[PDB]
Amino acid sequence: GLFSLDRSYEEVKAAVQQLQTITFRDATFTIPDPVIDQHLLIDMKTACLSMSMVANLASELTMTYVRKLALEDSSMLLVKCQELLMRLPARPQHVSPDDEIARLSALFVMLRQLDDLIREQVVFTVCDVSPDNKSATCIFKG
Amino acid sequence: RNMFCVKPLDLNLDRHANTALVNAVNKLVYTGRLIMNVRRSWEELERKCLARIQERCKLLVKELRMCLSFDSNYCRNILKHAVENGD
């Protein structure tokens, strides 16, 4: 839904083709009829709002952590991580733990708002399995 | 040395070393010490001037008192005014 905005129609088709297929737990599935409409539009709006608020709230310490870490650490996780970022001694310009606490407190609420739109409510929690995978015993919730 | 032409510009303090609080305190203490120094210098100079004027008046009155005459009496009566303020 987000990618469909302002992208060319043919590359939108290509992206939908590559995204619709999923490999999970050694099996392949494909989403039927991935139509873009009002129902996905409202979720896109809420996602955009939450991302705007997250970008606004985040402190300089949070933003600079990744950049500072790369100066002295080195790992596959980090190098694969920093490939996604735009390419650009010192002391922290401003230290204030109370402001940091309040800012993180609000940022958690915004992250929950962003998380909720992909989260699905848990209906069952399983602790047993038939060794043929046909049945299981679960606790119901919700 | 000369309190009338004071112009402070001297702070070469930098953002790298020392916290920002320390930097602010250093600038504040520079400004405050400048004010203190100028005020104390002026006060001391004024006090010295007052002492000189008062003792000159005393000596001149004592000198003039020995000759009783109208003009001398007029000068003495003028000099008898006490001086302890600019007014």
DSSP-assigned letters across all residues of B4-72: SS---------SSSS-HHHHHHHHHHHHHHHHHHHHHHHHHHHHHHHHHHHHHHHHHHHHHTTS--HHH
**Torsion sign (Cα): A111, A117, A123, A125:** negative
User: What are B9's two structure tokens?
Assistant: 């510009």
User: What are A70's two structure tokens?
Assistant: 């790369």
**How far are the Cα atoms of A122, A124, A136, A137 from residue A128, in angstroms, in the given order?**
17, 12, 5, 5
Resolution in A: 3.0
Amino acid at the residue A122? V
SS3 A123: coil
Element holding A27 (H helix, E strand): strand A27-30
Q: How far apart are CA A122 and CA A117, in angstroms?
A: 14
Q: First CA to last CA across chain A, in angstroms?
A: 29
Q: How far apart are CA A50 and CA A56, in angstroms?
A: 10
- A77 close to A69: Cβ distance less than 8 angstroms: no
Q: How far apart are CA B81 and CA B87, in angstroms?
A: 12
Strand partners, A124: A140
CA nearest neighbour of B14 among A65, A91, A97: A91
SS3 A32: coil
The residues, any chain, with a CB within 8 Å of residue A140's CB and separated by 6 or more, are A123, A124
Q: How far apart are CA B29 and CA B23, in angstroms?
A: 10
Q: How far apart are CA B6 and CA A140, in angstroms?
A: 83
Strand partners, A23: A28
The residues, any chain, with a CB within 8 Å of residue B30's CB and separated by 6 or more, are B8, B10, B11
Residue B69 φ then ψ, to 5°:
-160, 165
- A115 close to B40: Cβ distance less than 8 angstroms: no
